[PDB]
Symmetry: D2
Subunit: 330 residues, 4 copies
């Protein structure tokens, strides 16, 4: 069993915690954040988006008891003090957003952990791995990044299209759920003015973490794709809208056949495929990081097409954080 | 002064009514719908999206008195019984969505009106007109269509871009506000299954003919553009996301200059231009049918760009319906 | 096993269907609505509020196969043509909202059913039953009504409070989720003008008969309670705010104990009790029809208190419809 | 003209700024906050709730030019350094939420201002004044509080009811719009756990600033009223639901007559009165701090009644802040 410590109990930390409960190969043994244990128990037990925790949560002597198992709770601001070794932690899910470089994240290894997975794109050259794009390029590094939710949707789709038909160039939009960095009513956001406008009232243009990044996990596409985002008033689930010009001519039916084949074979559990009349709530809780929507897409011609793929930006990403933890521990 | 009768007091009929109050060249003299006058007065007086009516509304003996002017209220299901000549109606704003062919709309002319403007795309070969695209092709026809809100956004922008740089091909997405045909919670929508899903909970993919319809008002672009829509949980204002390949290479600065020049000249009051950090609510009440958002767009290279343009799908369209009424009356 | 036919596949019909899958004593064998089987299958399979159906749904030759069981699909507008006897239906869940009198609902019995449960308050003197208030008064009638979601919340709480402390008088407000009769943007609602205003934009005052209806299922309280509703922009879950004057003085701790004792005993599974910091989404999917929120309530003094109780207006009501079906079949 | 400085450019500061533009007796001459002038100009120009600023906003040499008038912009954290005297400031609108005691707010007077109005309830015994409740008790104090939005709605209504019929006891609920202290998705709120839950997803029980406070501005009601709040997913406008037991019997028509009389006479411009089918958006922009909704209320009997009153929690309060500034300067 891989013993895992979570640093940061925000949305990603908490959904990683829930996803880990369904996995026999990974056990969460410790959580660190600036929250009392009883407040941590409350945030785990009740979730507006995902419902009640499936299990029991109790607080005893300042720690969590989840499904009868004790979880060490700490509130260290400095990761070097986390004493991960005392709880036998193998891998740290680094989920605070505060330690996205090798120098800061490596303090976890001085605190006794063996490896670190950052739950966002690195701010230095820490390598990023995205399942269904480049997990097979992993080569023993002890600190890695799972990139971002949107990158986990875009890159597996882009890889299948590129490998089969050749992407000459592409532009993408993500119609993206509201996140925790937005504001409930117009308020201060001095480094991103649009992002301070009231989230439930507005469609909000925004820049995307995936524009800088598919090129890093799929170097053959570097320079060939960029894009942007629109934040809209839903609480979870987002959708990629990818417009590509293709080298090899392909009818929409041939594109569908290729995506379906990857979803049913090599990329099973990463890329999904549907022909149903789905909407965003149909993916709330979805584990696949990229669900191709066959009926939503449209081709102008055999070399110019708009492809649509869904992702639960909380659940898919969180599940793939756990996949990366397992992958780097094999 | 052109005397106008409104058939249908839904969103477009009521916003056309409000817009007409601010115009001296057009006077609403009659409204027809299956609603009592006192309910019509209530719908006019209070608007969740646009606020309280700017003026006085009185009900007197089953008719309306708005800003001191008497407005004849009728409730005919068959437009041939409307007796438009008895109030001197010149043009009918046909806003029920029910009479979108020449045979049905022509009943208004049998009822004594001289011309009909359909407030939606025609379902037969009735000619469509979009200001800033093809008002100048109008040739005296007595029944016309103002196309759709989305077409009114896309076509003026597409024209400026094509005229300056040559559109090889393009695909568009409109991120679109919730409309009256949607449902508050999952409910029956048997000819558009996704469209019945709860509007406030979902991002909802939807078909749009608007990009192709651009081919009808801009024949030089016929076959060169198509697209789709995502309905999202905002009550008004939508945004077009246009991905185009260009024949002539152009820097983003050159695209900005071309759009600004059109917004300040030939297309003034139709196409707008901003470099501010705007969000959708900043266009609630906007009269321009296409406001180019310079900072939101992105160029991958000199021949492949994503352009962003806002529209108030109620206010802009409604104002251009009145513009078409005045144009065909010259 | 009681065989049940559902007339009407709206929110309540579909949630009653889902709830029945989890019960061994009741089996749905037929559904009637003016919807094709494949559209019914789609509405069952995907739910914006409650997620994907837990099981398999197949359409075969115009009928449904759900979890391997065949379900007869019909589309009769007249319930007298329903031939309920041909599938052995014992009880009809009458969920169209259209047959709320003895004369209309009795057509199901002419069609071969033995008993009818209306999933809303009757419009004539058809008896109403609310679990935890008056199931024990049921006297073999062949047509009954399960009252309304709000009545199912208020009556069990009102009974515990009255039985223990004596309600002199009370007024209630339900802060109520958006429902299917509302509109996505301001639209026609000619018998309830406020109710046509855009549901996601507004707090909407609304009349409720539910508090008076408590007088029908709790005659000792007849004339002692009334109230109203505010519709707000959430898709599910509502909350009752009950302001009562008490005959016997009682501290808030004593009210808590009385409610907890009922929730743990006589009213187990109907009335619930929590002291957690809950919000509405924590009851999405709740089966109890009245969850008392101990921390939210407030006492001004020992005889004047404001009590707060949650209900999932879809799930709780739907489950108690099945409870009434089983009760009248004993 | 009263020269006014605003400390704090949050929602209240910005709407006070807009309301002051429509008043000839008050001129804003300076704003202090930790925001650059160009960002302040952006927040003034665009508002998701209230639309575009009615006027011109320019930035010149680090200060604002609003409708041609220069506004001194500063970013002092310590009010004692604000040098209000250099701009001739008479009264400070103290709108940061950080200086709600005499000792902290008085630093404005050492910085050269003559008087201070706190735009929230004081945390010490700084006297509170609410128009239509106790403005006439003002007796020359140089630091005062305008209490809170909900208190400005509740107290004028309570005064009219008490003066005419005698409130024996009452309990209130405010169904309250989302505010800036809430979170867009479930996030940390360690001193108010429910308040951290996602605001657009939830009905959120909350405590009220008006429960501690009508008793302070109407001492005759101290101990006789308390209440709580439900936060719901609307961006602005709230409603008070007041359940009172009355000393003198009064029919609902007599209560209506009394409220209407106050709204048309002594309390004109503070208390409003309507019999229309209004919803919350009908008061977005409303200046009255308490608009009685005659049709929404309900009487159980002549001594036990539920009264409903609307308030724009941004605009009404902000206008009355300006009224208090004028009042203490007379
Ligand atoms: O595309 P990659 O390198 O992540 O490969 C991972 C696939 O799951 C192989 O089964
Ligand atoms: O609509 P267009 O482009 O033909 O031009 C409109 C004219 O400038 C004024 O009607
Ligand atoms: O509904 P009541 O209160 O008569 O009681 C219900 C019984 O306990 C079980 O049906
Ligand atoms: O009720 P008060 O003391 O605020 O009196 C203020 C009224 O506006 C008097 O006209
Ligand atoms: Na596990
Ligand atoms: Na530390
Ligand atoms: Na006019
Ligand atoms: Na069953
Ligand atoms: Na002024
Ligand atoms: Na300072």
């Amino acid at each position: 069993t891989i013993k895992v410590g979570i640093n940061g109990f925000g949305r990603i930390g908490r959904i990683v915690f829930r996803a880990a409960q369904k996995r026999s190969d990974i056990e969460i043994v410790a959580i660190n954040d600036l929250l009392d244990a009883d407040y941590m128990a409350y945030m785990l037990k009740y979730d507006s988006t995902h419902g009640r925790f499936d299990g029991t949560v109790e607080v005893k002597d300042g720690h969590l008891i989840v499904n009868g198992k004790k979880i060490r709770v700490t509130a260290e601001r400095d990761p070097a003090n986390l004493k991960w070794d005392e709880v036998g932690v193998d891998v740290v899910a680094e989920a605070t957003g505060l330690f996205l470089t090798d120098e800061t994240a490596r303090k976890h290894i001085t605190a006794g952990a063996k490896k670190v997975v950052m739950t966002g794109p690195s701010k230095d050259n820490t390598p990023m791995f995205v399942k269904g794009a480049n997990f097979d390029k992993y080569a023993g590094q002890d600190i890695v990044s799972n990139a971002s939710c949107t990158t986990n949707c875009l890159a597996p789709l882009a890889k299948v299209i590129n490998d089969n038909f050749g992407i000459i160039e592409g532009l993408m939009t993500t119609v993206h759920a509201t996140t925790a960095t937005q504001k409930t009513v117009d308020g201060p956001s001095h480094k991103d003015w649009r992002g301070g406008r009231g989230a439930s009232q507005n469609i909000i243009p925004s820049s995307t973490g995936a524009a800088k990044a598919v090129g890093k996990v799929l170097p053959e596409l570097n320079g060939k794709l960029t894009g942007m985002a629109f934040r809209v008033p839903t609480p979870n689930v987002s959708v990629v809208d990818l417009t590509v010009r293709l080298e090899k001519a392909a009818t929409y039916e041939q594109i569908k056949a290729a995506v379906k084949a990857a979803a049913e074979g090599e990329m099973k559990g990463v890329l999904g495929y549907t022909e149903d009349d789905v909407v965003s709530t149909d993916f709330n809780g979805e584990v696949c990081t990229s669900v191709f929507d066959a009926k939503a897409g449209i081709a102008l011609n055999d070399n110019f097409v708009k492809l649509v793929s869904w992702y639960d930006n909380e659940t898919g990403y969180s599940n793939k954080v756990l996949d990366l933890i397992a992958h780097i521990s094999k």
